[PDB]
Design a protein around this ligand. Structure first.
Ligand SMILES: C[C@@H]1O[C@H](O)[C@@H](O)[C@H](O)[C@@H]1O
Ligand SMILES: [Fe+3]
Ligand SMILES: [Fe+3]
Length: 683
C-alpha cells in the first residue's frame, strides 16, 4: 500500500513510533519510522522527500515554513480547557513556593528552559524579558540573544544552546550530551525537574507542566505573574505569559497530505484518549521519567484537529507571535520605512491601475498590491503584507471572522456628513429592478432570468437569496431561476449561463472581479438590460447608469422609466420610490484592518481623502471615489469616509438584523478562507 513516513527525534521517540507502526500495518494507509538527530534534520528530510511528517512546537512550525522547507501545518494538537478545549496553550514561569523574588528580581537567578527556540520554553520568556527591558538587547547587532540571556541569569539549562557556555551549566547529564534537545532536562517536564532539583530558581513551561510532573506537590510551587505577583499553579489563566498555537504536524504541500490525515485520523480513534489499547498516541500524562514524556505528541494533547488547506504556518502562529520570533532574528533600528504609507489591496487589472494612479498621486503615501480573488486581500492584511481594503457589507463579515476590524466606512448621503453627530445612521438599500413593458413581478421570478452583482455581496446576493433561504428554508440557490448571472458563482451552472466573461485571451466568465462584464452593481444592471429579466442591486444603480451618467454602447441611451422596482411583495414602483419599495436597508461598505493598525491608516486615510475626496485639494489630479461606473477600490456613490469609533467590532458595524442573515446564510457553504479563520478564531 502506501506507508506514511514519520520522522522522529530520539531513541525513545523512535521506539514509540515503531511500536505504533507494527499496529498500523493492516490499515489502509500504513506507517513507517525515520529517526534523525534534531527536529531540524527531520524538516530537511520531509522536504527532501525522505520523510513525510513530524509534530513541531510553534517556534519550530515557524522554521518548517521558512524556505527552502516551506512545510505546511496539516494537523493541530488539541488541549483540555474549560472554555472549550482548542488548539492552544499557556506559557508560565514556575518557581518554588517560599522563595520571595518577583518576576522583577529574575536577574541574577538561575533558570531552566525546555529547548532553545521553543515557545513556552524560550520564545515567550526571553522575548517578554527583552520586551520588559529586564534583559538588554536591541538587536542581533548588540550581540547574540544567548549572550544576553546568559548575562541576565547566573546559570541556566537551555537544551539546544551552543553559543553561550553558561546556558548549559545547570543541565544534568553527560558532559558531552547534557545540553541536547532530548537531554534529561529538556522539554516541559525536563525543565520542571531542573527547577525541582534546585538547579534553577525558575522553570519556563506550559500551564500543565507542574500537573504532569508533580500533582500532589503543587502547593510547593507558585507561578511568577507578570504584574509582579505570585499565584498558585492553578491560576494560569489569570497568570501566564502568553497563549500559543498548539504543536502541529507539518508536511509537504502535495497530494499526500490528504492521505496522512487518514493515517492520523484512524490512528486517533484506535489509540486516542478514550482508547482501551495498552498503547497510547497521547501520553498519557502524569508523573514519570522525563525521558518518556512528550514522545511524537505531547502527553497533554487529547486530539488532532485537521487544519484547513488554506493554512500556512505564518497564518497559524498569528501576526503577533510570528513577528516576535522575527524580532529576535533581525535587528530593529532599520524599520521606519513601511509603517507610514498604507498598502492598499487592489483586486483585478482595473483596480490595480486605479490604485497605481493613487500610489503616484499620493507620492508614496500609498502603495498597492494586486490580487485576483477579493478574499486574497483579507489574507494579505492578516499577514501584514497588506494594510487595508474596502469591503462590501457581506465580506466585512468574513474579514471580521478573520480578525480584521472596520475602521472607516463610506457614506452615500452627502459629501458633508462624515463628521456628524445625531445624524449617525449610514446605509443604503437593496432593490429588485426590472423593465417597463416587463411582465415580471417579484412573485413571478419562479422561472425568470436574473442578474446578480457577485455572490456573497449585500445587495446582489445576501439580501436577495436571503429572502429565498428564509422563504424556501433551503440552501440550494442555483435552481430558482431558469438562468441568470452572479460572478464568483459555479462556472458550470444556470447562474453563470447568462454571464458574459472577460471577452478575450483566457475566458474569465463568472469571475468575481471587474474582469467579468456583469460583475458589480452596474454590471448586473447591464445583464438586466441585455440578457435577463431581473437585476438585484443598489438603490441608486439605475440612476447611475441612466441620464448620460454612462456612455457605454448600451446605457448610452437608457432612461429610468424603461425600468421599474420590484416591491418586496405585490407591485412595482418608480425607481425613485425605493425608500418605500426595497428588499432591505443595509450596512455601508467599509475599510478593514488589523486592530493594531487602526490608529495609523485611519489617520493616513484622513490625510489622503483630504487631498482626493469629493471636494478635496487635488481632486483634479485624482479622485478616490470615481471609476467609470465600475466601483474601483471604493463605490462611486461614496461622498466621503467616516471614522468608525475606536473599538467597534465587525458585528456591531454590520448591524444585527443584517449580521444575522450572513451568519446562517454563510453556513450553507463556507468559503475556504472562512474555514481557515474560524479555525484560528478559536474553533
Ligand atoms: C525513498 C524515496 O521515497 C520517494 O518518495 C520516492 O519517490 C523515491 O523512490 C525515493 O526512494
Ligand atoms: Fe511548545
Ligand atoms: Fe454592497
Amino acid at each position: 500500500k502506501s506507508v506514511i513516513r514519520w520522522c522522529t527525534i530520539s531513541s525513545p521517540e523512535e521506539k514509540k513510533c515503531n511500536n505504533l507502526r507494527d499496529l498500523t500495518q493492516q490499515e489502509r494507509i500504513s506507517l513507517t519510522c525515520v529517526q534523525k538527530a534534531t527536529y531540524l534534520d527531520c524538516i530537511k528530510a520531509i522536504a527532501n522527500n525522505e520523510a513525510d511528517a513530524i509534530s513541531l512546537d510553534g517556534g519550530q512550525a515557524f522554521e518548517a515554513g521558512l524556505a527552502p522547507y516551506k512545510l505546511k501545518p496539516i494537523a493541530a494538537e488539541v488541549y483540555e480547557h474549560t472554555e472549550g478545549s482548542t488548539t492552544s496553550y499557556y506559557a508560565v514561569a514556575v518557581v518554588k513556593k517560599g522563595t520571595e523574588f518577583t518576576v522583577n528580581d529574575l536577574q541574577g537567578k538561575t533558570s531552566c528552559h525546555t529547548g532553545l527556540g521553543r515557545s513556552a520554553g524560550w520564545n515567550i520568556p526571553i522575548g517578554t524579558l527583552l520586551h520588559r527591558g529586564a534583559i538588554e538587547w536591541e538587536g542581533i547587532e548588540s550581540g547574540s540573544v544567548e549572550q544576553a540571556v546568559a548575562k541576565f541569569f547566573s546559570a541556566s539549562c537551555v537544551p539546544g544552546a551552543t553559543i553561550e557556555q553558561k546556558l548549559c551549566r545547570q543541565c544534568k547529564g553527560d558532559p558531552k550530551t547534557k545540553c541536547a534537545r532530548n537531554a534529561p532536562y529538556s522539554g516541559y517536564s525536563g525543565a520542571f525537574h531542573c527547577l525541582k532539583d534546585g538547579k534553577g530558581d525558575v522553570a519556563f513551561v506550559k500551564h500543565t507542566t507542574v500537573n504532569e510532573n508533580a500533582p500532589d506537590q503543587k502547593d510547593e510551587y507558585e507561578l511568577l505573574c507578570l504584574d509582579g505577583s505570585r499565584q498558585p499553579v492553578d491560576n494560569y489563566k489569570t497568570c501566564n505569559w502568553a497563549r500559543v498555537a498548539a504543536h502541529a504536524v507539518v508536511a509537504r504541500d502535495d497530494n499526500k497530505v490528504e492521505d496522512i490525515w487518514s493515517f492520523l485520523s484512524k490512528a486517533q480513534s484506535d489509540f486516542g484518549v478514550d482508547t482501551k489499547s495498552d498503547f497510547h498516541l497521547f501520553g498519557p500524562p502524569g508523573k514519570k521519567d522525563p525521558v518518556l514524556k512528550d514522545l511524537l505528541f505531547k502527553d497533554s494533547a487529547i486530539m488532532l484537529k485537521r487544519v484547513p488547506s488554506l493554512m500556512d504556518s505564518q497564518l497559524y502562529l498569528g501576526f503577533e507571535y510570528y513577528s516576535a520570533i522575527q524580532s529576535m532574528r533581525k535587528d530593529q533600528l532599520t524599520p521606519s520605512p513601511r509603517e507610514n504609507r498604507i498598502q492598499w489591496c487592489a483586486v483585478g487589472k482595473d483596480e490595480k491601475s486605479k490604485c497605481d494612479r493613487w500610489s503616484v498621486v499620493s507620492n508614496g503615501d500609498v502603495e498597492c498590491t494586486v490580487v485576483d480573488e477579493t478574499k486574497d486581500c483579507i489574507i494579505k492584511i492578516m499577514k501584514g503584507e497588506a494594510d487595508a481594503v474596502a469591503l462590501d457589507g457581506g465580506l466585512v463579515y468574513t474579514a471580521g471572522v478573520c480578525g480584521l476590524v472596520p475602521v472607516m466606512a463610506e457614506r452615500y448621503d452627502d459629501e458633508s456628513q462624515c463628521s456628524k453627530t445625531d445624524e449617525r445612521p449610514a446605509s443604503y438599500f437593496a432593490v429588485a429592478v426590472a423593465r417597463k413593458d416587463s411582465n415580471v413581478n417579484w412573485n413571478n421570478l419562479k422561472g425568470k432570468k436574473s442578474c446578480h452583482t457577485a455572490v456573497g455581496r449585500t445587495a446582489g446576493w445576501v439580501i436577495p437569496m436571503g429572502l429565498i433561504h428564509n422563504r424556501t428554508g433551503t440552501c440550494n440557490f442555483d435552481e430558482y431561476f431558469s438562468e441568470g448571472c452572479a460572478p464568483g458563482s459555479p462556472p458550470n451552472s444556470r447562474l453563470c449561463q447568462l454571464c458574459q466573461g472577460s471577452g478575450g485571451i483566457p475566458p474569465e466568465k463568472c469571475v468575481a472581479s471587474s474582469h467579468e462584464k456583469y460583475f458589480g452593481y452596474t454590471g448586473a444592471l447591464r445583464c438586466l438590460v441585455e440578457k435577463g429579466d431581473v437585476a438585484f442591486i443598489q438603490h441608486s444603480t439605475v440612476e447611475e447608469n441612466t441620464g448620460g451618467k454612462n456612455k457605454a454602447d448600451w446605457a448610452k441611451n437608457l432612461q429610468m422609466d424603461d425600468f421599474e422596482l420590484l416591491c418586496t411583495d405585490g407591485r412595482r414602483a418608480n425607481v425613485m420610490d425605493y425608500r418605500e419599495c426595497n428588499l432591505a436597508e443595509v450596512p455601508t461598505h467599509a475599510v478593514v484592518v488589523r486592530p493594531e493598525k487602526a490608529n495609523k491608516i485611519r489617520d493616513l486615510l484622513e490625510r489622503q481623502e483630504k487631498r482626493f475626496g469629493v471636494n478635496g485639494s487635488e481632486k483634479s489630479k485624482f479622485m478616490m471615489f470615481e471609476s467609470q461606473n465600475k466601483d474601483l477600490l471604493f463605490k462611486d456613490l461614496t461622498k466621503c469616509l467616516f471614522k468608525v469609533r475606536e473599538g467597534t467590532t465587525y458585528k456591531e458595524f454590520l448591524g444585527d438584523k443584517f449580521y444575522t442573515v450572513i451568519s446562517s446564510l454563510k453556513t450553507c457553504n463556507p468559503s475556504d478562507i472562512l474555514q481557515m479563520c474560524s479555525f484560528l478564531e478559536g474553533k
